[PDB]
Symmetry: D2
Subunit: 234 residues, 4 copies
């Protein structure tokens, strides 16, 4: 199966979890893969992925390093066909205990960083390209002590609705991929909420990312695809 044959894929935050599972899958599907990470752990990830995957150290939030990331991609690949944006950002604090630090860190990574990651990619984004933004079931549900994270992910999903109108006739699709909790006591409690009776696997999220990245989803844009075992559907 070579469902991403001759496609250039850039994946931010692909050093672990969903990003890493996606990098592995995209390489397996024939993509020329560029991944980013902040820290070494990137070199290990690149070895684990293999298949000619290249790593670029970049702080996805930091603006000047994004310029350097896209300069490298332009020089080495000349275009982007798949952009998969995974942002870290997130911790738990209830209202009454929320700090400026938590707000700033979460939104800088999950919202601001994402906006500029995509904006700076625009000149490289080819006709028939696909931008996949990692959301969360948190963005449309209620969870105790999770309001800052949840709000950041609500903001994230909104981007897909709106940017598809700014990029009219450019042939760039933009979609949100929204996982429930995955494997990567608490897990037993979370699994009880899920209709399917278990938490997701990073690889299952990666398979859904593949759908959105691939030409199979050619008439899917502005959407939010939940990969949640039913958790946010009931």
């Amino acid at each position: 199966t070579q469902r991403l044959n001759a496609k250039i894929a850039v994946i931010t935050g692909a050093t672990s979890g969903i990003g890493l599972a996606a990098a592995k899958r995209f390489v397996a599907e024939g993509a020329r893969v560029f991944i980013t990470g902040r820290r070494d752990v990137l070199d290990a990830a690149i070895a684990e992925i293999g298949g000619g995957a290249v790593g670029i150290q970049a702080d996805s939030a930091n603006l000047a390093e994004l310029d350097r990331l896209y300069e490298k991609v332009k020089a080495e690949a000349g275009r982007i066909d798949v952009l998969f944006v995974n942002a870290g950002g997130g911790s738990m604090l209830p209202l009454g205990e929320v700090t400026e630090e938590q707000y700033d860190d979460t939104f800088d990574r999950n919202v601001k960083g994402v906006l500029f990651t995509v904006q700076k990619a625009l000149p490289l984004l080819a006709r028939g390209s696909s931008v996949v933004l990692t959301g969360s079931t948190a963005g449309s549900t209620g969870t105790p002590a999770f309001s800052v994270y949840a709000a950041s992910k609500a903001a994230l999903r909104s981007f897909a609705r709106n940017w598809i109108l700014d990029l009219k006739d450019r042939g760039i699709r933009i979609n949100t991929l929204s996982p429930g909790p995955t494997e990567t006591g608490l897990l037993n409690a979370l699994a009880a909420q899920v209709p399917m009776g278990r938490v997701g696997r990073a690889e299952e999220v990666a398979a859904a990312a593949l759908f959105l990245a691939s030409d199979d989803s050619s008439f899917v844009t502005g959407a939010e695809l939940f990969v949640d075992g039913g958790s946010a559907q009931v």
Copy 2:
């Protein structure tokens, strides 16, 4: 690729449009396919066009007794169902003030009642790791002039996916709604209507193991139509 290798697929309403495109794609992906259609001539033409050993049964998907005959045939010839694609559709346009009992009855009998019993009667055959795909519509979550009966039927349709996944706890049966927008323009963010093969490709995603943690969901294939 062979994403539905050794799978048994049943597709209701597969003699034209999206249903037909899905049957073609499912066969291409290695599925053993059973299809239904109301009319013999279009069904024979469809079976010929699909190829790949596809089998056709002339059945009205909304008629409960004919559903019994479909599933008797599937049981005898295949023994199980791994993929059920319920592609019931149809409706017409009447504004409030002009809605007839006929329009209501025909639309709901086919789009809601027929679907419920199609799935209910399939249950004994649905294997562990099976996937049920229900054809919804962008109409089910939007407003359109003179479309209220159809829109309401498709809203009911989508609800089924949220609820049946709870009735079938631990059975390993996923249920998802596939909701196309306009298919083969100015309102669509992508600036065009969708192609049948594009809806079929999304159907394949939901039918396949790639969607193994997707259930109760509504996947829009609408060029952004119902997303803005």
Copy 3:
């Protein structure tokens, strides 16, 4: 006196939310017409409501009885300012056990009956009138053994999105009011209400009066720029 000199027609108002709405609407100055299927129950409801409220025997699963309802309203009031379509209900069966009767009887009341209740009201609905449809949190959530009822309430909500386009320039607003769990065999009932309350962010089920108060908002001029909407009165239950 927020419904002073308004004619309100409420279907299914002999108990629970409908009754609570009838009482509130009368308190707010409305001339209230209610429907119910059982004459003795209907009469007792009218006695409870008071304030000149009038009862008419009718089932929405019956289009002929709707015709008679509106003949009566036309003759006695000549118009409708507020139409609260609350008549409906359902039962529990899981997939595998759903009967034709459960499907038909639920949809005949909750969907078909609602459409014709509103359609047959159209000639009487004044400029500036408000139609309130009783939905449910069930219409947008998943609940075991509830698929027929849930689908009926999803259909119901869709009507508000669509009819507001059909009724372009008619000055008729259409909104869905969607209650969560409300306190509307006795040992089992108490145990289930406790489990329902545990789900609710507010930690209790709603009172019928609270749903009636939200119905009043939608019926009143305060909601003059609210149409096509679904107002949840659920203590947060379908919001999380």
Copy 4:
């Protein structure tokens, strides 16, 4: 006649438009009203226009220290808050490709960060049986060209209502989002999209705010009430 009799209401951003209309309605309904504005002259003019013993405090929500001063004055003068209508906010229009850090920061600092801290800092004063109303927007759940920053901020805003009601379990505080659509060349363009065929009046939004503030909405929490003439409903 008096649906907010002897209630303390604090409205941020109430010197024009919806906020001002809400201040007038709340006063007419018997509330003791405190309003907030950024410009002292405008604030004083608003107070004179409102009457009914309404009191004004100069405050910017992009400034956490000025929120502290606001609640210091409310505590000193009223000792509690029963209704908190967080209406302060704004935005501007830029398409993806042209979004600036300033547009992002300035929008989120008021519409998201400022809202979070406005509510958090009110918590000690919020009485049992109190109501918090957050001004959202139809933009928060729709797509609009050149509007992605504002839209995302209002998606985040609505998320707060889903989540904070869990943080504040048993506190007797309701939190709801009030989401206006078009409200009074460009107006006629907006009006033709509205099912009701016109933009909303500020007084109509204020009436819906009153519902959420009042005891009539006692079993409404975590919700989003659209006051949009059908705009985002179709």
